[PDB]
Design a protein around this ligand. Structure first.
Ligand SMILES: Cc1c(C)c2c3c4c1OP(=O)(O)Oc1c(C)c(C)c5c(c1C4)Cc1c(c(c(C)c(C)c1OP(=O)(O)O5)OP(=O)(O)O2)C3
Ligand SMILES: Cc1c(C)c2c3c4c1OP(=O)(O)Oc1c(C)c(C)c5c(c1C4)Cc1c(c(c(C)c(C)c1OP(=O)(O)O5)OP(=O)(O)O2)C3
Ligand SMILES: OC[C@@]1(O)OC[C@@H](O)[C@@H](O)[C@@H]1O
Ligand SMILES: OC[C@@]1(O)OC[C@@H](O)[C@@H](O)[C@@H]1O
Length: 90
């Protein structure tokens, strides 16, 4: 079996973020034109997806981390990762 990745990018340099689920933990590797380095994201999960968008010069990232039947959204809006409001179908 394999580690599971998800990727997003923005701008023209570009910035790239790659999320890897391995052994129940999701971590983040980052590129901004000057080498790869480890990002701040650390959350539990066996499955990962990601999307991002810009508002002006501000990036917003949403990572969807799942274990079992539970998906948790994690939000980056420039000031630390916080849990998002995402909930599944009812
Ligand atoms: C993320 C993920 C984990 C954590 C898994 C498994 C899978 C998995 O999904 P993914 O990697 O996308 O899909 C697989 C792929 C691409 C291949 C080629 C697989 C398997 C899976 C399924 C089946 C599988 C799984 C195993 C183990 C130990 C083996 C040997 C194993 O047979 P293997 O001959 O490699 O075949 O258990 P493990 O605790 O790693 O659980 C089950
Ligand atoms: C405490 C602290 C935080 C929270 C920072 C930064 C710095 C910082 O001070 P310090 O570490 O003492 O001094 C630095 C040192 C010694 C080096 C070698 C630096 C940077 C800093 C500056 C620049 C820097 C900063 C970055 C990021 C993502 C990178 C890649 C990044 O380039 P990097 O190749 O590491 O170069 O943002 P980050 O959110 O970490 O903010 C900025
Ligand atoms: O520059 C690296 C960083 O601050 O970029 C925004 C997010 O990807 C963070 O998790 C990450 O640590
Ligand atoms: O500011 C965080 C938030 O409102 O951003 C938009 C969506 O990702 C929401 O689930 C999330 O709670």
């Amino acid at each position: 079996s394999s580690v599971q990745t998800a990727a997003t990018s923005w701008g023209t340099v570009p910035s790239i973020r790659v999320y890897t689920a391995n052994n129940g933990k999701i971590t983040e590797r980052c590129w901004d034109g000057k080498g790869w380095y480890t990002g701040a994201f650390n959350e539990p999960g066996d499955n990962v997806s990601v999307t991002s968008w810009l508002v002006g010069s501000a990036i917003h990232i949403r990572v969807y981390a799942s274990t079992g039947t539970t998906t948790t959204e994690w939000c980056w809006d420039g000031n630390g990762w916080t849990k998002g409001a995402y909930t599944a179908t009812n």
